Amino acid sequence: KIVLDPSGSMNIYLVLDGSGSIGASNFTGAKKCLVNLIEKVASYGVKPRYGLVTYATYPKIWVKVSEADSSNADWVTKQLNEINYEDHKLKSGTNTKKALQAVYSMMSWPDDVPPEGWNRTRHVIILMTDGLHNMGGDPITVIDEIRDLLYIGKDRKNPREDYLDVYVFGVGPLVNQVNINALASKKDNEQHVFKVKDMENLEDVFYQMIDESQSLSLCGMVWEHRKGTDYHKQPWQAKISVIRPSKGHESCMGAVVSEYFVLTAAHCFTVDDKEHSIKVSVGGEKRDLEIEVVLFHPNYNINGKKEAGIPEFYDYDVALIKLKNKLKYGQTIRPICLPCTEGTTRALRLPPTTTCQQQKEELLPAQDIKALFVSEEEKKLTRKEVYIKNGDKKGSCERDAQYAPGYDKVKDISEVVTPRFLCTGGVSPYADPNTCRGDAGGPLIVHKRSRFIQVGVISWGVVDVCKNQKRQKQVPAHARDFHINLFQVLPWLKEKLQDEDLGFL
Amino acid sequence: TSLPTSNEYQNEKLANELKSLLDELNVNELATGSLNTYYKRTIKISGQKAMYALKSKDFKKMSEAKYQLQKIYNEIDEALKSKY
Amino acid sequence: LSVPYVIVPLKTGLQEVEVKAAVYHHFISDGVRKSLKVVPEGIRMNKT
Amino acid sequence: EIRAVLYNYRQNQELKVRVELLHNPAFCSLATTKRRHQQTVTIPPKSS
Amino acid sequence: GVDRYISKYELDKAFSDRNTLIIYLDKVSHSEDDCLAFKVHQYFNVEL
Amino acid sequence: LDEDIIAEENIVSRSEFPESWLWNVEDLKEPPKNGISTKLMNIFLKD
């Protein structure tokens, strides 16, 4: 497999066949597969040394692991994308043995003294070919020299089997399984052989080889493989149900933020709601998790202007729930990243000296921002893509609040719509779905650099298009939804969650 | 036009069911790569049965392969959840 | 039913033997991969 | 109205069945000697 | 609907085998008619 | 191949043939029903 450790030092050798047995369209699919892989690797925050080699009759080395540029993901992606199938088409042999000898030269140290960290270093080789090596000698004998040189499998006391992993991708229309199965590494319950049909559905391919041993707790990281369920697609997604006599059953959403804490709206609960009447289910288990206490925001007040004439006041509609027992992160249980944290800095691939304001600028520009929230359809979680109206139409998004039932004759718009609210919904630039009342409390999700950051919490909507418990049939276009900005309540979260050790800047 | 006859519609419904499982077959065969050798042995055996059943259009083999491929799919689903 | 085969060992050690079988008109198959010891000629002696 | 129940207790095989009510000169239905009252139905496994 | 229920085992059958339907009503008024309706579609294409 | 038989390559061989296995230890800490703990262990069989 492959271990993802932030303290790691790993060499990744990319060998790409360029013989006529491949074809241009399949060679491009080979490139698109590598580009997605390199991007997904950089999402974990690990910096390996990349080696890029294309070979036919003679190997051509593009990136050597000795260069400092080998640790640049974007630069290697640029080098790979520029490579063309007909770049060395006129030398269209298949001499894999020489290409492996070049890799052997890369890991080979000068003279007889290996640099320190040779056994500390992990080595990974990825080969793509048709299994029809026609030029040069046997390629397997170079593998034995690599096994010997790295002292792998040569000692019972220290096997070193986990320091080398070999994957082979069967590309091109015609392909030979026999030689490919011989080239690939063979380990118990580890996939190292891939066929032509495996080139589709890439997320499942990487799911088999990646081992998240030292990367379990990273925030905002999703498994998108086809077999995955709702919670593979939303690890932070938490379903919160409140059932209490007289009040009855009610359901809201929540987002995992730490081992003990889930973030959700405040208006879903009340001070009268007892902790035993609140049930939260993260991973989808039917075993409901017990809670300890609900931390309402100090400045929250639903009846702040009730005597003035306002029915409900949703300012600072956030709450932190502390679980009775701490969660154990996994493939279906992971937190969502929070703004102005070192984790968000590493998620956005920013230097450690990046400020909270610089992160604020990137997340919330004065424009329409692509985002999404979570909704339920027939007891199944589904994604709804929306736009945050932060540009010039931000005023028009706030103005549509006048059509909300119960606030039609309220004179002052700035009183009810506080700067905490982020405004979505509408038909411009594109149609944004409107939330059900059960969808309230969920996070407002933005996607950047193959990761997911939370920027808001679902608050309330102008028009309840999902009144009859169904969001069926068309609705007027001015139905807007409002969400609580995280930057406004950032001091309260930093104060409360500083004991969870999330690395606030 | 005239509506389809007795068995033509029924045979199509069964085929659509088999086609659906076959679309995720390559994914499931891949998913067993990190699982125990029991699954890898079981699914590749159950895979061809469905593949031959579709191109042969044999009702007997298409029915069995459907439930045979459905069972190993459920075994993989439980295996991945308990493996975490 | 027993199906005999004839083979010759070529190298010493716990070497590998694999056989497969498949039936027609049903997709039921089985395969057996076992290993047995290839021993060079000779015998044990416990001299003092 | 009469109800005919057909049981299939195979564990992995659904059955396409030709079922027919035959004519009787003492009872009236679509079943006559000329015109048979036949249907083709499918029973899921372990179901009726 | 209130005073109305259909079992899930009956509900999830859909077009494949729903020919006999079972609808449960918790009560029916005695003063005037209580009604309901639904569409039907032919999918077998047989006359008579 | 188009014939009505499983191809050889996809035939996967049984190879795990140890005589003895399941050398495990477990503690009965499950909720006692009439003082008797009910433990469930999902185990892989061998070939």
Ligand SMILES: *[C@@H]1O[C@H](CO)[C@@H](O[C@@H]2O[C@H](CO)[C@@H](O)[C@H](O)[C@H]2NC(C)=O)[C@H](O)[C@H]1NC(C)=O
């Ligand atoms: C990398 O290589 C050495 C090989 O010498 C590995 O073995 C260790 O060697 C040092 C000094 O010779 C011993 O103190 C350790 O106990 C060895 N490790 C064992 C036996 O597991 C070692 O993995 C690495 N050396 C380091 C990290 O100094």
Ligand SMILES: *[C@@H]1O[C@H](CO)[C@@H](O[C@@H]2O[C@H](CO)[C@@H](O)[C@H](O)[C@H]2NC(C)=O)[C@H](O)[C@H]1NC(C)=O
């Ligand atoms: C490599 O070759 C092509 C390149 O995309 C793809 O395979 C199919 O090739 C046939 C004829 O060569 C085309 O008619 C299809 O449109 C291709 N795509 C399919 C079937 O999805 C594919 O990417 C690779 N594999 C093979 C076997 O050709």
